Amino acid sequence: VYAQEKQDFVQHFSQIVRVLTGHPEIGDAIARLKEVLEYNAIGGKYNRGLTVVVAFRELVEPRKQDADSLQRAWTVGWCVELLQAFFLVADDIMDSSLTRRGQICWYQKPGVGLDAINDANLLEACIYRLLKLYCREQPYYLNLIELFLQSSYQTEIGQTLDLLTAPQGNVDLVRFTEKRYKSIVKYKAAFYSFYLPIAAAMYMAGIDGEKEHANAKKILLEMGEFFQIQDDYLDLFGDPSVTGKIGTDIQDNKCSWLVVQCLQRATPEQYQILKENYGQKEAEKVARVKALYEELDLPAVFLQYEEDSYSHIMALIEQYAAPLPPAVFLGLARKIY
Amino acid sequence: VYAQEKQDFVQHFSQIVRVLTGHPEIGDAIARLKEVLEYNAIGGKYNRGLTVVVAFRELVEPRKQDADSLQRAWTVGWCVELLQAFFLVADDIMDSSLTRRGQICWYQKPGVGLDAINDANLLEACIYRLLKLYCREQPYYLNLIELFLQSSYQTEIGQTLDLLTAPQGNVDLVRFTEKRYKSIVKYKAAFYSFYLPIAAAMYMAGIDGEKEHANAKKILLEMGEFFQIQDDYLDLFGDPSVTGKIGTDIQDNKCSWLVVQCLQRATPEQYQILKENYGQKEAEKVARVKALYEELDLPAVFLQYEEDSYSHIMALIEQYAAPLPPAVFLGLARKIY
Numbered sequence: 114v115y116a117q118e119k120q121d122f123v124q125h126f127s128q129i130v131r132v133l134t135g136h137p138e139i140g141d142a143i144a145r146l147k148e149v150l151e152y153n154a155i156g157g158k159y160n161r162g163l164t165v166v167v168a169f170r171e172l173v174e175p176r177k178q179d180a181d182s183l184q185r186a187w188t189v190g191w192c193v194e195l196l197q198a199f200f201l202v203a204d205d206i207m208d209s210s211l212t213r214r215g216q217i218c219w220y221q222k223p224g225v226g227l228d229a230i231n232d233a234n235l236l237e238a239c240i241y242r243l244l245k246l247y248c249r250e251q252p253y254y255l256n257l258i259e260l261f262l263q264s265s266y267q268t269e270i271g272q273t274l275d276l277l278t279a280p281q282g283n284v285d286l287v288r289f290t291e292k293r294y295k296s297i298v299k300y301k302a303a304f305y306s307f308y309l310p311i312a313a314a315m316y317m318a319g320i321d322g323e324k325e326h327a328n329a330k331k332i333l334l335e336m337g338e339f340f341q342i343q344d345d346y347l348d349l350f351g352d353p354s355v356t357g358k359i360g361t362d363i364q365d366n367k368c369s370w371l372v373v374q375c376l377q378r379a380t381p382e383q384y385q386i387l388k389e390n391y392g393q394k395e396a397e398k399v400a401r402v403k404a405l406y407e408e409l410d411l412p413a414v415f416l417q418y419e420e421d422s423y424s425h426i427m428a429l430i431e432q433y434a435a436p437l438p439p440a441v442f443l444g445l446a447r448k449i450y
Numbered sequence: 451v452y453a454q455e456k457q458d459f460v461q462h463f464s465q466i467v468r469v470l471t472g473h474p475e476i477g478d479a480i481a482r483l484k485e486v487l488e489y490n491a492i493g494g495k496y497n498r499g500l501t502v503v504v505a506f507r508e509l510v511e512p513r514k515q516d517a518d519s520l521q522r523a524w525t526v527g528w529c530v531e532l533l534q535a536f537f538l539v540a541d542d543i544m545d546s547s548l549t550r551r552g553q554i555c556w557y558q559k560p561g562v563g564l565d566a567i568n569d570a571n572l573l574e575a576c577i578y579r580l581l582k583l584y585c586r587e588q589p590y591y592l593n594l595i596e597l598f599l600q601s602s603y604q605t606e607i608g609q610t611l612d613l614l615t616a617p618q619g620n621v622d623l624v625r626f627t628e629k630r631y632k633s634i635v636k637y638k639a640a641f642y643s644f645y646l647p648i649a650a651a652m653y654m655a656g657i658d659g660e661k662e663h664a665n666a667k668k669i670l671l672e673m674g675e676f677f678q679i680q681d682d683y684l685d686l687f688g689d690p691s692v693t694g695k696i697g698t699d700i701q702d703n704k705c706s707w708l709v710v711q712c713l714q715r716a717t718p719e720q721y722q723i724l725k726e727n728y729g730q731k732e733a734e735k736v737a738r739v740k741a742l743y744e745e746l747d748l749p750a751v752f753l754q755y756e757e758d759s760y761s762h763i764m765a766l767i768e769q770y771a772a773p774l775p776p777a778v779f780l781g782l783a784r785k786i787y
């Protein structure tokens with residue numbers, strides 16, 4: 114479903130850049146915007162943006178899937194990729210990360226630095242520019258603006274919770290609880306990751322019912338929770354040649370799923386080893402935390418969690434998919450699991 | 451007009467915080483949002499936010515100025531103050547500034563640092579939260595969302611131009627031209643400063659005509675240009691106990707109105723003195739640039755410019771105010787001149 118549709122979606126990016134790139138006085142700023150778009154919105158798997166297009170084609174009647182409607186689906190897809198690019202550029206600064214999508218983080222590039230804050234804001238502004246340029250005369254225009262703005266607010270509340278729970282050089286393991294973890298992931302990852310692209314396709318298809326959006330959200334928020342838990346696992350146990358990024362969760366004192374699982378399994382001595390080595394820059398201290406995680410068999414605990422989560426989401430698809438075609442959620446589940 | 455209306459406007463901030471402050475799981479994030487709002491949206495002159503309220507009362511018929519309409523005017527006023535707070539928090543980071551509104555910059559506060567990037571994003575999100583909570587059922591709802599989003603995009607293009615023209619440790623005086631300066635100020639300051647609050651009051655009053663908005667923009671963009679030129683002057687020649695902020699334009703290699711005026715008046719020897727001392731941290735080098743500016747009588751050049759600008763804007767009010775009451779623009783001109 115995502116496979117052949119990927120080519121046409123990635124090919125549509127050049128049009129998005131052309132349409133986004135009022136006198137020649139702002140020429141140097143438009144060139145900088147092009148540079149920011151090319152560096153930060155290209156190189157990923159495009160799964161969020163592709164989900165708009167795939168879901169659009171499964172929800173809209175083929176007679177209504179005209180050339181202009183497809184153009185709008187691809188643009189709304191790229192709007193979701195731009196929301197993602199805005200949050201990642203800012204998150205890389207705030208998490209002091211080194212690489213993203215197999216290249217150095219935009220802010221780490223010589224000559225960029227903290228100018229990346231405004232670049233991230235420009236990426237966010239491009240979304241509403243594209244929605245006006247392509248969807249202004251559509252009946253779902255306000256639904257889409259409100260959806261992107263709401264997704265941005267919920268993600269930012271999540272980021273606030275993430276940063277509050279991880280104060281630099283302030284190790285407080287008591288703060289790292291299961292309830293706190295579930296709250297962080299729900300807001301920072303679950304709304305914008307899967308609910309935003311499906312909801313966008315739903316509004317474009319004329320599906321604006323409250324109960325239909327609530328039912329889709331019940332499946333999608335659980336898939337978003339799994340996705341962030343997997344993200345936390347891959348921060349330490351993933352192959353950076355596959356993830357395209359270097360992990361910083363232990364160094365940054367994050368309330369990771371791994372530290373939460375460690376804490377509910379650690380002995381008082383193991384707890385002390387974690388206490389002495391967590392939230393610190395020293396490679397040797399980070400290695401001690403990873404050693405403790407491997408000793409507590411957190412990779413096998415995660416493998417069991419992935420299996421239990423998959424079955425749970427599948428049970429939710431059976432309960433809540435109707436009247437939407439279950440393929441909408443199944444295609445997405447196959448992509449993230 | 452602004453004087454007695456200031457009290458009711460500032461008193462309405464506690465309501466805005468209460469309405470903005472969905473389970474208790476995000477409680478710590480809401481407390482952080484309250485902290486960010488109190489530190490970054492309070493302490494200024496509130497002229498932009500007050501302009502919405504003052505213009506609303508002068509454009510709307512008194513019979514239609516009911517208790518609920520006034521509540522919406524105050525909220526839209528505070529939305530403009532929040533847009534300003536979002537841009538200033540990020541601009542202080544990017545300009546490496548020390549103080550703002552008589553206190554240390556939010557990002558310079560111990561324990562905040564680069565977390566301020568997400569805080570600035572939350573301030574921007576609060577705008578659209580308030581517009582939905584108070585103006586969702588109003589006929590001008592979409593006009594206001596589009597206005598705030600457009601103002602944000604234009605401001606960001608301006609910031610891009612500002613940062614591009616000021617690369618750190620890269621002194622290139624040839625880039626500092628009058629045409630480049632006019633382009634920067636137009637985008638980064640003129641749209642969001644005066645056009646945004648008057649346009650908001652205009653849409654709330656049912657004034658949505660293209661020609662009426664274009665005529666108001668012709669007056670207001672010129673007032674915005676003056677305001678940024680005055681801002682650049684006060685960066686070096688203003689009293690920080692009145693401005694509430696320490697100047698960084700010379701240290702940051704900015705395309706200031708002062709450097710542009712210096713360049714069109716400097717001898718080849720004076721040009722070399724500027725070349726050797728501009729865009730550098732050293733207090734002695736900054737003092738040499740200020741000495742050169744004082745030698746070229748840039749404070750008197752600015753005083754003449756303020757006089758010529760005032761008369762020009764007044765001539766524009768005579769040409770373009772109609773059918774709006776000229777008091778709308780006169781009250782604003784008395785406040786900034």
Ligand SMILES: O=P(O)(O)C(O)(Cc1cccnc1)P(=O)(O)O
Nearest residue numbers: 200201204208268272301302344
């Ligand atoms: O890519 P990362 O950086 O691993 C992340 O998932 C990026 C991200 C950014 C913004 C919102 N949610 C997740 P994080 O939470 O910082 O681990």
Ligand SMILES: O=P(O)(O)C(O)(Cc1cccnc1)P(=O)(O)O
Nearest residue numbers: 537538541545605609638639681
């Ligand atoms: O307050 P400042 O910092 O003097 C400024 O006017 C703040 C500002 C921020 C964003 C957009 N326009 C002006 P700047 O341009 O950096 O001189």
Ligand SMILES: [Mg+2]
Nearest residue numbers: 204205208210
């Ligand atoms: Mg990160």
Ligand SMILES: [Mg+2]
Nearest residue numbers: 204205208275
């Ligand atoms: Mg992060």
Ligand SMILES: [Mg+2]
Nearest residue numbers: 344345348362
């Ligand atoms: Mg991560």
Ligand SMILES: [Mg+2]
Nearest residue numbers: 541542545547
């Ligand atoms: Mg500044």
Ligand SMILES: [Mg+2]
Nearest residue numbers: 541542545612
């Ligand atoms: Mg600045």
Ligand SMILES: [Mg+2]
Nearest residue numbers: 681682685699
């Ligand atoms: Mg300034």
